Ligand binder design. Sequence first.
Ligand SMILES: C[As](C)(=O)[O-]
Ligand SMILES: C[As](C)(=O)[O-]
Ligand SMILES: [Zn+2]
Ligand SMILES: [Zn+2]
Ligand SMILES: [Zn+2]
Ligand SMILES: [Zn+2]
Length: 76
Amino acid sequence: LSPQYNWVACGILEGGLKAAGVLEEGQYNRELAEAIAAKGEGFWTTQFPQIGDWNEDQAAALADRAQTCGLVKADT
Ligand SMILES: C[As](C)(=O)[O-]
Ligand SMILES: C[As](C)(=O)[O-]
Ligand SMILES: [Zn+2]
Ligand SMILES: [Zn+2]
Ligand SMILES: [Zn+2]
Ligand SMILES: [Zn+2]
């Protein structure tokens, strides 16, 4: 219930995700994570495995925040 996952924050989130253009209709947690990671990888990820990982890690976790907001469906 608390100001962790309300509609405002989730709105800011949903906004931000459509902004960077990775959100989609009927989308699954995993599909988004992979899209966020795509737009995340550049020099630093492609040149450093450890940052390449950090990317996938945060990309994955961000989709989790996104799932709790009802923005994406759980993987099936
Ligand atoms: C209201 As909509 C464009 O996030 O399906
Ligand atoms: C529930 As939606 C992110 O398709 O408007
Ligand atoms: Zn929709
Ligand atoms: Zn990791
Ligand atoms: Zn997950
Ligand atoms: Zn929406």
